[PDB]
Symmetry: D2
Subunit: 387 residues, 4 copies
């Protein structure tokens, strides 16, 4: 009873994940930097399908065109040697001190133009390597104090930046879509578009909404105490789940980025149940950081645990939905009735229906138990294999 | 140096606020029920402009048409005697046991039809009394466990309900708009459309989006650790701030509903600064609960404190924006540059601009300080009157 | 592969748990009151070992001595008929309006004396029924505002009350110990002795500290985002884990009191691992509330799930500690070295030891990986039965 | 109406505060390192009374005895030139990779011995410079996973380390006391002794408890959603408030370390009211980080704001306690009765007192309002100078 990933499971990792040196707000790096080529080769051996990157993880900031070409050729050769793909790319608009007040919403206009130029250079590179999704995480867009940022002007600048990138893509004829990833705080006191709902609502005001979706991250909605599977069902309902970042988080605290399955394990089960039952077919990407307590062996063990946890959860959710006893419980709790229209008969019919009001027996309907606890224990038994 | 409210300040209160008997999850009522007529008269004496109500606060659940008419006539006479208005009305779809699994998203279809009928009866009453906004708080829509609610089917049922109410309003020719009020949890484990962003995104999928906005509540976004003034700027940016619920909350915990100004006092200052500078002209509604430790004198003192706090905050934010030294600091922090387009020159111009990339001096731009702390201390001095 | 509780597992429940009518801050009761006799009989059939009670769950507030005796005789007969025990009793000092500002720390002295008298009457009853532990939850001790309670005077009054109860017990020669249960908020804005550490520190200032321990509750430390198993290890380290309240909670929000195993499932696993490995031999008490969505069948199903979850977790933690591969991993992560004294050789020896400083090779020690992720995945595999 | 600090206000700052280069989990330093000599001179000009330091802020890790002596002589000359004192010193047991699993509770015994040796070397230096308090923050003591740390063995190692340091101090005849500073998480997933209560309870198990107190930090208890002024009243009640760390934090999130007065402004008011009314006479130390958005001018402006905010709050709390109208309100809310013994008459007298039970009129006592809202609005008016 083994759970081995294969490239067909679509498991992906950022170069910055297994590549995290372990520098935190209070401590120095505990591990030496890894060459991207080595990470590609080690991930291919564990069964991953591909890798993702921020421009600066691949090309050291400030590289001359000559060095650039060389970093790209070497990476390209490792992808050719392993059959690894690059489904998503993104921009680092947060490390360099120039981005201290943001990229697209920095108060200085010069910095905003530079941010857009640095992003466009990376879209051309992503297209060349075959990425289908381009993620945007505005980690420096926000503030630590109320007067420092007028939010309405900041959203106009954010809209302007995204509309210009959609103009660029369409003008070049590229087949690439954008995914905004929300985060409520850290490193800024408060970050703009803090949750999946704030990002979905913002998208609706862009000039070409169809080019943009969301890249929700497990730990980020949990940093606001929200239910991750409910936010994902809302992104699926809107047709905007373009990509997803998988990891673990223990509650409302700093962003831990623990391996997938760590953190809220029951939320992990319900998320896998939803992705698999809705038919999500994008990459299963891990945005995690192997703890700084680990050496290189612990890095690979942590990345391997990410994929394993997904596969065990997949099996338990499939056994849960497939159990006749669970199907019976779902009917007992009226999940079948939630799926039926409340009033397909129309407004006039509902208004004339005496059984909906005048003769509705409220006490009899109130007395019906929902049987949710029996259903939840069945889900618990299946997650634990005590079924 | 007094701060006296007048009906022109547009201060409103729910009947259920000063009318809260003090029953909590762990204790019995500490105060006798108040007749709505008495609350109207006491609020008019404190300087309020109007009151709001849930159907059941005005007409005891189960009232016969005869008793209904009588409760309405008496209320109407107290409004005529005091000049109080009723700008907003809403439905109680949470107290009666029948709503234990929700109103519009209850799993039982019969309950969903009943919820819609109970709501429509109250819209006719609200229109008759002159309300311009009809609020919807789905406090029972959500779940305590993952299998109990399929969220995509729940959003289809929620969409269906709102579309049917927009069909009803348009069919009757009423001038009334809807405002959804988000709340992340309590009484359900997790509530659907948990934050202002989730409610704004949902609105965009209704058949007539222009009929719906949001009614954000101070304490509810704070229950998710979010910045209330930033969520309000986002609702203003979208043109959807139809109404607002003012109160106080001390962090991530149960919903306290403390008087406005209690809780996060600096967030209260920045919210008043934003409402007044954006020109919000709807009601300033208080959705609060005088603590159960109080008698009737403490109830009126708490409601009076709500209005006073708003007025003191209004004065301090106006003195802050009006100070030449602050205007100078805003320019020093580049708030003026955040308001200018990043690239009014267009994409091609930005692409050809060498000053935006090829010749941009990153180290010089990085070295510029933002001067936000000096600006924040000025705001602090003005809030405390130490200016 | 079944997990059937027997009275030998020491599973206990409060009358107020399966007896919860479902009244919440926003809604009416969804279930009829249960007679304590019926609850005793139903719990005995599920395999529970005993029940616990607050004075008011057994004797309706205000009962005459005549009615009192009658409620006691009937209860006593149901305990005799089923073989159920009563290991713990406690006082309701939170429901009646008189306790609106507290019991032992109410500002009115008359209320504080009444609280003590009501408590002493219940200690005599608990002793008569055989309880060995008397719990104290000061749910109304605290405040919603800063000026309402001087905390140093409130701790003097709290100390005074506990010292008087220890004087009473010793004077009567009773074999009963006290357990304080902490809670950080709800129903008060902030509650005194908010966490297990605040309660342990307070105990050390009582006149007879040996008579008092703690009754930590899973969901209460989680309402402050703390690690429940770490707080329990600290109460065990101090020799003060007198009793424990088991339940589930999904993060920092209102107190959910979900069935044990719901909420943070990995914290439940590590707590069971600790109770069983430390040899805790007190009752495994469930302080939970079957959701108001349920009827009586759902109440019994929820209580049965509490015991089942404990038993499955017990098996998985025992299989985890018993696996040779895990024992090897524990040695690889140096758990054996954490158990050895850092300097049994003494201060002078450590000061003269050049290998501890002058010749310590920091880079070599820094480079050693801790291998915690491999260990954590082993724990994950065992919890999920994928081992 | 100015508020100028003088050395007599006892304001202190860590070298690491104004010296923070701005490196965060997601970005590079935005400011050049400051020489400690420059910080001493700039702080003396703003009116500070002294500075504090971690060993590594003063002596670069790895310095030879020769360089050590030189860093000390230069610092000593700047203290002599400005009249600045050094009231507290502490150890960096968190930055170097060797401390990745802790200092005193690292699983490797060699690292624990090294941690103790590095600490003892710094106590001798602190004594030489005149510090009276030696702080201990175990930021790396804790874990990200359940199996990595047995907490009971970790507390035995923590006790062992503190007992050895108390043996060292007593053996050398030094007049120095220890203060443990709690923090609930960050950088570890969960940190041991997470709150002021966990640290106070732990102290009671050391061999010489009188040598140890607490150094609570505003933002750290707020990271657990707790009330900082209530935790401080508890440390004062126990006689253990040896030192204090002042700053601001906006809720449950990463540790912001904002300037004092930022964050929860009403908690800042109640804390100043308590320190001043209890007569705390230790240093008013700021443990803050000027935001990375700032240049050197913004660093000094932020440190100056820390002291200003304290002084404005001091004035408003003194005006609040001094107002006859407030004294009257305090009596109306029975604060005077909370300060009187509940039963100075003794247990027997209380037991025989019929007015405490048999004839106590519960309904009359329940009906008395506490008048807390009127009192809280008075406090609000005084904080805002609207009084
Ligand atoms: C480095 C980033 C990217 O912006 C995003 C890619 O999904 O994930 C992060 O790690 C930020 O969360
Ligand atoms: C009773 C409700 C209404 O639905 C809303 C009116 O603004 O406010 C509440 O009190 C729910 O928050
Ligand atoms: C009713 C109470 C008791 O004080 C305690 C018994 O363990 O548990 C509660 O339910 C309060 O948490
Ligand atoms: C650098 C530390 C010290 O341990 C403590 C001194 O009060 O404060 C910090 O900044 C850790 O919070
Ligand atoms: Mn993250
Ligand atoms: Mn991510
Ligand atoms: Mn509310
Ligand atoms: Mn509201
Ligand atoms: Mn509880
Ligand atoms: Mn309990
Ligand atoms: Mn801090
Ligand atoms: Mn500190």
């Amino acid at each position: 009873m083994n759970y081995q990933p294969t490239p067909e499971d679509r498991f992906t990792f950022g170069l910055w994940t297994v590549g995290w040196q372990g520098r935190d707000p209070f401590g120095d790096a505990t591990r030496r930097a890894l060459d991207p080529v080595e990470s590609v080769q080690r991930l291919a051996e564990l069964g991953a399908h591909g890798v993702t990157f921020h421009d600066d993880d691949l090309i050291p900031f400030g590289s001359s065109d000559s060095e650039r070409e060389e970093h790209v050729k070497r990476f390209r050769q490792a992808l050719d040697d392993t059959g690894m793909k690059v489904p998503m790319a993104t921009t680092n608009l947060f490390t360099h001190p120039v981005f201290k007040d943001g990229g697209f919403t920095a108060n200085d206009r010069d910095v905003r133009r530079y941010a857009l130029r640095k992003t466009i250079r990376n879209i051309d590179l992503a297209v060349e390597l075959g990425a289908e999704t381009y993620v945007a995480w505005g980690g420096r867009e926000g503030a630590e104090s109320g007067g420092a940022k007028d939010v309405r002007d900041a959203l106009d600048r954010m809209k302007e930046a995204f509309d210009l990138l959609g103009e660029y893509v369409t003008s070049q004829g590229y087949d690439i879509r954008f995914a905004i990833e929300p985060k409520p705080n850290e490193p800024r006191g408060d970050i703009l578009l803090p949750t999946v709902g704030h990002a979905l609502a913002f998208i609706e005001r862009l000039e070409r909404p169809e080019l943009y979706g969301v890249n929700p991250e497990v730990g980020h909605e949990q940093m606001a105490g929200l239910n991750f599977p409910h936010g994902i069902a809302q992104a699926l309902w809107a047709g905007k789940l373009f990509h997803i970042d998988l990891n673990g988080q223990n509650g409302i605290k700093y962003d831990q980025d623990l391996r997938f399955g760590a953190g809220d394990l029951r939320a992990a089960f319900w998320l896998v149940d939803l992705l698999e039952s809705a038919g999500y077919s994008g990459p299963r990407h891990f945005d995690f950081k192997p703890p700084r307590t680990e050496d290189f062996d612990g890095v690979w063990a942590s990345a391997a645990g990410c994929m394993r946890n997904y596969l065990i959860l997949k099996e338990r959710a499939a056994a849960f939905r497939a159990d006749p006893e669970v199907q019976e419980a779902l009917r007992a709790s009226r999940l079948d009735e939630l799926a039926r229209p409340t009033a397909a008969d129309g407004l006039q019919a509902l208004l004339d229906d005496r059984s909906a009001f005048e003769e509705f027996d409220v006490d009899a309907a109130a007395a019906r138990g929902m049987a949710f606890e029996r259903l939840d224990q069945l889900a618990m038994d299946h997650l634990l294999g005590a079924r």
